[PDB]
Amino acid sequence: NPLEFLRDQPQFQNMRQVIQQNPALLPALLQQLGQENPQLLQQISRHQEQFIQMLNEPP
């Protein structure tokens, strides 16, 4: 799945940041990921726990 790198790369963290302080655009990054490629979303399914886990970065 293309998420492996997504979860590893700042993609997950980075997002949390922008959306963390500036929660205006929200973590849409995911919407564009699953939407972009009709196959991505499916593979992304493995996320949720990890993806969202960071989406709520403590700091």
Overview of this protein structure:
This protein is mostly helical and 59 residues long. It has one domain: XPC-binding domain (Arc Repressor Mutant, subunit A, Orthogonal Bundle). It is 64% helix and 0% strand. It is built from 5 helices and no strands. It has helices at 3-8, 10-21, 29-36, 40-44, 49-55. Helix 2 packs parallel to helix 5 (49-55). The longest helix has 12 residues, at 10-21. It is globular. It starts with a helix and ends with a helix.
Query: Would you report the number of β strands?
Result: 0
Which homologous superfamily in CATH is the superfamily? XPC-binding domain
Q: Gap between N and C termini, in Å?
A: 28 Å
List SSEs in N-to-C order: HHHHH
Instruction: Choose one word for the global shape.
Output: globular
What oligomeric assembly is this protein in?
monomer
CATH class category label:
Mainly Alpha
**Sheet having the most strands:** none
Q: Helix/strand-derived class? A: mainly alpha
Number of helices: 5
Q: From the alpha carbons, calculate the radius of gyration and give it in angstroms.
A: 11 Å
Percent of residues in β-strands: under 5%
CATH topology heading? Arc Repressor Mutant, subunit A
Tell me the count of domains: 1
> Can you name the CATH architecture?
Orthogonal Bundle
**Proportion of residues in helical segments:** 55-70%
Subcellular location: Nucleus
Protein name: UV excision repair protein RAD23 homolog A
Organism: Homo sapiens (Human)
Family: Belongs to the RAD23 family.
